[PDB]
Design a binder for this molecule. Sequence first.
Ligand SMILES: O=P(O)(O)C(O)(Cn1ccnc1)P(=O)(O)O
Ligand SMILES: O=P(O)(O)C(O)(Cn1ccnc1)P(=O)(O)O
Ligand SMILES: C=C(C)CCOP(=O)(O)OP(=O)(O)O
Ligand SMILES: C=C(C)CCOP(=O)(O)OP(=O)(O)O
Ligand SMILES: [Mg+2]
Ligand SMILES: [Mg+2]
Ligand SMILES: [Mg+2]
Ligand SMILES: [Mg+2]
Ligand SMILES: [Mg+2]
Ligand SMILES: [Mg+2]
Lengths: 346, 346
Amino acid sequence: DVYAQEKQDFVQHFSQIVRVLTEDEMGHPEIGDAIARLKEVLEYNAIGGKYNRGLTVVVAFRELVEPRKQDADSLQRAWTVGWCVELLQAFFLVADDIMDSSLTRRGQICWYQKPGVGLDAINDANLLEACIYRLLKLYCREQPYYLNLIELFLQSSYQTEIGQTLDLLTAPQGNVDLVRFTEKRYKSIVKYKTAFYSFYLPIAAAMYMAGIDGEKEHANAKKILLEMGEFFQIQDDYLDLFGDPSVTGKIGTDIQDNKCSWLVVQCLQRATPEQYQILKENYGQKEAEKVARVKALYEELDLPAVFLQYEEDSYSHIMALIEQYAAPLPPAVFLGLARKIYKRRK
Amino acid sequence: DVYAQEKQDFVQHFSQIVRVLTEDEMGHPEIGDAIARLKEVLEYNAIGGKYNRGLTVVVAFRELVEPRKQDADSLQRAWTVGWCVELLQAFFLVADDIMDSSLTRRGQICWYQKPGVGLDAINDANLLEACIYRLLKLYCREQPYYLNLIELFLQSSYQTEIGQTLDLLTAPQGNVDLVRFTEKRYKSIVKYKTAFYSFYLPIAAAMYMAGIDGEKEHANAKKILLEMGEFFQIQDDYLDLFGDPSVTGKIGTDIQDNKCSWLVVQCLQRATPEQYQILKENYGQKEAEKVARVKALYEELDLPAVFLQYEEDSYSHIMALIEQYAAPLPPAVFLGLARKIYKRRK
Ligand SMILES: O=P(O)(O)C(O)(Cn1ccnc1)P(=O)(O)O
Ligand SMILES: O=P(O)(O)C(O)(Cn1ccnc1)P(=O)(O)O
Ligand SMILES: C=C(C)CCOP(=O)(O)OP(=O)(O)O
Ligand SMILES: C=C(C)CCOP(=O)(O)OP(=O)(O)O
Ligand SMILES: [Mg+2]
Ligand SMILES: [Mg+2]
Ligand SMILES: [Mg+2]
Ligand SMILES: [Mg+2]
Ligand SMILES: [Mg+2]
Ligand SMILES: [Mg+2]
């Protein structure tokens, strides 16, 4: 509901984000064509998702700053930073689609597959990351939280980068190993590859902008938000295989890529010895025939129910933690976000 | 000579760079395997070049700080930052080899071609970039130039990123257009893709660490160093086609990739109408037969002499600029670097 009413404001402010990025260097008409492609890149990769992260920065701001201080300028910084988290999303997604050999994202062909693009997407992605800090300097160079934000973004990027590495080491194409698809490994992977950038980044950005920079308060908000991250990745691993691609906006690839997905981990735990061998014979291959064999053993082990039960048990634990750790922050902050991902299908 | 005596110190300090990066997160043994691959990545991509940029940071430091202040700690920051510019080099090169479809770098198979690696190099490269700011915080979090350095690196990355985009837009594989291979375009491309990160970054880092942060002094050092950048790229475009790959450490690819190389631009200027058509028919194709046809028309137009004459005329203009703009800095600073790239073959 709150993301709903703020969504439109958020998106309309994207025109300006683009204006500022594609003009601040246009007094150098030499790099104009380059700046032109940047507009194009942003428009294609920054737009089309749910904006949960960017909205979260904005929503969390309004709930942590006394309305006497939510002035005109200060409010603008909120959605610029919200759009900065949105650009981090774009950076990492463009890269990840290349690396996961994905076909669609946000219900279009992935950037790297847009004809004319391909592996130039690599440079396009770095550019997206570069813009984060262009905006940060443009709109906050003078706030006292300016250095806190630069470091929170850098730090978060590094973290998810470690995550991605963890992700990729565990899923060697051609090296089907199920032994490594454990639980400690999964929790570690999703923590670094999703949790920090998708939940602690937005809320922490809003805290630092609202003066809330105590170490314990971030430590506590993080304790909640990292647990929401893992929930959120597990939802995503599920939808990879069990969701409608016309609705997720992306065609799933986890089983083919030999990914340490939640399912394959929960599948190993319930694996009768015969089934294990079936999993060992079909996982991590591009053959449709073999992939469906996998889906089948998932459905034979009623995992699609285990996921629904985890979802409940998990959602209540998050709740418990919001009840344990939220204060002095408004529980609205964490409830609002958590309510926006419960049962989701995209 | 000065890079010579400082080289070894510089390289030996790499053991510690690696120690600090692969231990500061090892109190989290979960991401240990990831941290393991980071060691591996660094060792493969940070090591093996000439270290001109990193040495430059170090050499330029010793020449701008009164020896009374070149203490133990302060000196360590110098080569850490020198190694940070070295990591930026690695970041961009790993990416560029993928995008240029290169085969070797620094006399080994490119990272992305190391079997087991491929497009995961994309994430490995981002990690390299991430380490820059890990070190920056580890060793300078408390210097007064701390924010100046973070912004100089970010800014320089963005700049070379615009450059790379400029580079790639101009060289569409399959779209052989010679009309775009002009001079204004070339100067613009090399300025952003090489000049800022390879010459202004190192020297400016050393200036900021030595307190020299006046706007005019950086503006003047930049005026010299941007002109050295263009010289240096033109040398590189030449060696691409006319240098021994066993000595450059890399197999050239400019003609195949349809690159706006210096040669092809100087070739268009001297193109009799018949030759132009020959260029139009062979440029930007992978066929060895057609590539050599190109090399031939270059040698028919004695470009390998035009490059030697540019080299002289250019080197003297740099000299003039060191004589015009160096002060209050020691001309040694700019002479030292410029003397380390004159006539180079690798
Ligand atoms: O499942 P992935 O981790 O590859 C993914 O969730 C992206 N991602 C990457 C890090 N965190 C999330 P996507 O399904 O959107 O391709
Ligand atoms: O010639 P490129 O610009 O591709 C190169 O010089 C790398 N580079 C990229 C930007 N600046 C330099 P390399 O020959 O080393 O592949
Ligand atoms: C960590 C994950 C699952 C990456 C995609 O997340 P979202 O589905 O929330 O990304 P948007 O397309 O809405 O940006
Ligand atoms: C801009 C260019 C030419 C990239 C390679 O430069 P260097 O040849 O100086 O890189 P190193 O391998 O010595 O790092
Ligand atoms: Mg992925
Ligand atoms: Mg993916
Ligand atoms: Mg997924
Ligand atoms: Mg290149
Ligand atoms: Mg190259
Ligand atoms: Mg080159």
